[PDB]
Amino acid sequence: KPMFCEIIKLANRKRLIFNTTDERVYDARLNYCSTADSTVQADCHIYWRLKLRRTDAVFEEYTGQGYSLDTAAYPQQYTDIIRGYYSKHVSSSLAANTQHFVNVLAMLRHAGACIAHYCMTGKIDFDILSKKKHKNKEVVTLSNADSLSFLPHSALYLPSPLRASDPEIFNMLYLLGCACDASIAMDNISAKYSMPHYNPLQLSHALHVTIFYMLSLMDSCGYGDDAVLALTSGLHSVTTVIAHSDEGGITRDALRELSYTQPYGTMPVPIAGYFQHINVLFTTQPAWDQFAGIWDYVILATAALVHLSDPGMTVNDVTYPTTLTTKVATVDGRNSDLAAQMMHSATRFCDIFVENLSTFWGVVANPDGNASQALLHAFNIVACAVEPNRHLEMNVMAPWYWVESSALFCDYAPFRSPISSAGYGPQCVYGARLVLAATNSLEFTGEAGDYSAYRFEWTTMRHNPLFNILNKRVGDGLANVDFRLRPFNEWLLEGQPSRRSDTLDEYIWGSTSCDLFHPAELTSYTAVCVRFRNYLSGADGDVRILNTPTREVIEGNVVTRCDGIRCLDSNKRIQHVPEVARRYCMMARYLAQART
């Protein structure tokens, strides 16, 4: 069964996106409460941003060159369903070991483009679905499918029992065949096939049920990974989830670069109950609201799978998220060595990402890697390219974080990832209270006359959500936290390079887009000494207590809860992006001579 926990559907979207300039925002609130005292609490706002890349992004030139799956034969029961489609004279004497190979990934990609276009703007009709190529489509006419062998090209065969079972799947597969350069073969017509007029409600329902039909069709052949990869590539081909880190988003470009050849095959009448249920209530003729909500949710969830699932490098026995550092300087937005490092990390990213993309959907992962190698080749196309890339003009990158997966999945344990076990990944589970560690394992070294010193291992800021709570305080939150006990102020992925050609508020990312920290933000590989300012001693001679958490708050865990999720218009605060120092440093030199 697929997982569709209805998170984005409850946001109740009102406005329609018609141009590239505006964007749709979904914000969640996470409440952070220290278990030691309930005074120390904060509300972190997570803003996901969605934007339509182009008005005519669906209407794009179909090249027809790309990944092709020429070995996708049916199992025994479907082959029985297909031999039920021949003539009775032919079906009485036909080989049981016959194989009807099928490719439908290009129609999955186009239907993903049409369905995310319907999420972005309320318009959909036969004009969008066929890419203006149903006006002059000439379907060939044959009887009983014994004459299918007569056709020289491999033909998209749409039988008459599929039409007599339910006509909306037949009509929608004819429309998606008209979208691609497929040769369509039918049984009966009444020269050109004429389908009944659909309102966009039934048309969106037909688009929905054919998406799940084609996913069931490919999972029946075992090649469900290619199906869900083609559907994710189709979803991100017309929409653009705006990246949380300016670094990330190369995975979005790899999903944009995926293209497929001309579809072909025979479409059986589907077996009853291949999918048990899709754990969300969906109806015939749904509104734009609920349909756009459920499918915006699957867009954001398959965007969150890249942060939720990635291979973490083990640097000196303690796990860190993959951080790729080059020595050569960047020329014209290009880095060859950094590209080689992201290929070395993508060869292990692609397997676990296609397995968890399958695990997100209803399909099981093919143990033979087919979507993973095609996605790796999509990375190989988007790198080593002559065009300048915005996502590579840097010397330090941390690729797999593209959007935050904190409060977007109701359940996290079916997804496999070592990074979620390493302390990163899900920060707050929706619908539950998540009690996790406040800071790194520490030792109270000493207390000065007006400060208090602690020694952290400092894996990364994301193991320290307590500084989230200190971030959202309007006063005395991070100005009191300062770093002067450590001898060298060397940090990989510095907070703000603009100030320096020292307090934790001075070097930290802006983070106005999302209050939670990047999993490699302000990372270090050595132990750090932090000191807090508990009191304030004036010049005249009096002291006053500042709003600094006490000692037992630091060893006392943090309960995280999730508040509601709503929809907003864009404003300047979320549009602001942090300036990040991405260059070779002393901690990068420690990373080079580390264990890794």
Place this chain on the structure above:
Amino acid sequence: CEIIKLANRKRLIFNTTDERVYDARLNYCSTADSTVQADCHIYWRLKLRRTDAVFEEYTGQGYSLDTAAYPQQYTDIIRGYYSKHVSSSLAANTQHFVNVLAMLRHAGACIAHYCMTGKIDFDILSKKKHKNKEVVTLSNADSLSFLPHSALYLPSPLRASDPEIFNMLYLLGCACDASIAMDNISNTSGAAKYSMPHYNPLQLSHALHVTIFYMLSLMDSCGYGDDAVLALTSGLHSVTTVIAHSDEGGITRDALRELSYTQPYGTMPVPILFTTQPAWDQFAGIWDYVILATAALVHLSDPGMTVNDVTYPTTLTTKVATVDGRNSDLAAQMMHSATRFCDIFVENLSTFWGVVANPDGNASQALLHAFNIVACAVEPNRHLEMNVMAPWYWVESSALFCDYAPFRSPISSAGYGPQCVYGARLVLAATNSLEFTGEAGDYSAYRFEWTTMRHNPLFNILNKRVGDGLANVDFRLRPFNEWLLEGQPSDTLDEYIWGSTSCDLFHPAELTSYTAVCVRFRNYLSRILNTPTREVIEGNVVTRCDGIRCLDSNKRIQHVPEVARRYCMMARYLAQARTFGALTIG
């Protein structure tokens, strides 16, 4: 009970300027001398927050209640409902949950708007969005579709047993946006549009009244009864503005206004005090008693400061100057005081509504988070402009309860709290511990072991008698003894009391001096005055309530008293006790 229900009011309020003033007449009389006595009028002012106060925008961002499981009988009824209809059978095996807290907040909001304004139709109940609201239909559901865990499911036997509660739960689901899922919708106007019969406001008010207590009984069966009544009172105070007796001290009102909840979900089984469709008067009386009883409850549930093993009301103290009308150092102390206050106020709200509170006390966590929202936000707030406060007095609790026994109060163990019980006579001490310092020409000096003005109620009698009120009584100010929360900036005792016209009673921490004070009376004027004798000063005072009468706005009571809140020497004593230890003030 019915303390304000018997009282009859006919004034209808349609704007935020007009207000409804409840008056309680109080007789204070000494036990030793009957001829010295006084009538104190205490006034409650209720008004509209805004005209569009019930139409405030529902965010969806708010407190999220979890683990709100049903008892075994309800789960059996719900599993019968799910096994009855198709595409619901898989949802029977899991433990079912519920959340109607946003529905209860809007329910309290719209009944407060009905009890204040007096007009209700479907546009007001559902925030005029019911006319465009698609109801998902399980009969029209797809074969792949599944009844999920966060859609509000309204069964057809709920419509069969009691369609008034069914329709009202539908309207409150339209108000606080959710996925309303019914079994089948009659396609007479729209395919999924649910058309409704027209109700006169009496039947609609009765249906809303019974469905509020229906949801309260449901959440009480589920175990979370305190959070349900907390959301209900949050909506009630969210619409009705109750003007505080102490000026600039209604922070709890703004904390209840900053509450919000997540979007409601669950399923509504068949259930396991008027019966008729009432007039506006009786319904408004019982719910205005609910509102003013919670406004008394916020006073009755107050943790106490311990200063040299003496119990005082929680009074808070900063030193830093105000910026943008707010003090963060004051706000942090208010958060600590609220941390104790929420645990004590939720227990008292549970004892008021008759529901048992959960042991973890997450409703107190929601209220404390509301205090964190109102305390750590950037707006020009009138309430936090000051330096020194007594936060947790909002409305005087005297003569609002038949008894004060089940309320667990750590401040009414001392002399603080209600001065009179309604329908009863309450005898209490007129003065503190005393000694007779002496008597001279035309004056008589008593050494008062001074704690506060509320421990010395007798002076209000001296204020409210005819002739001169408290002009004869004055102080001898030594250098050690210093006042806090004074009456006016610029030695008679009338200059030191606030002169609050909203209520004749004194504020808890009206005038606090940790040390003893010397008070001299003027017995003779050189004739003889009406100053009481020594047995009247040391003798007790009985307190009684005599009727409650409603009235319109008076310009006398609308004037707020002056407190002269500034950083003082006693504030420095409290600061030194806070940061250097308690032994520095011993």
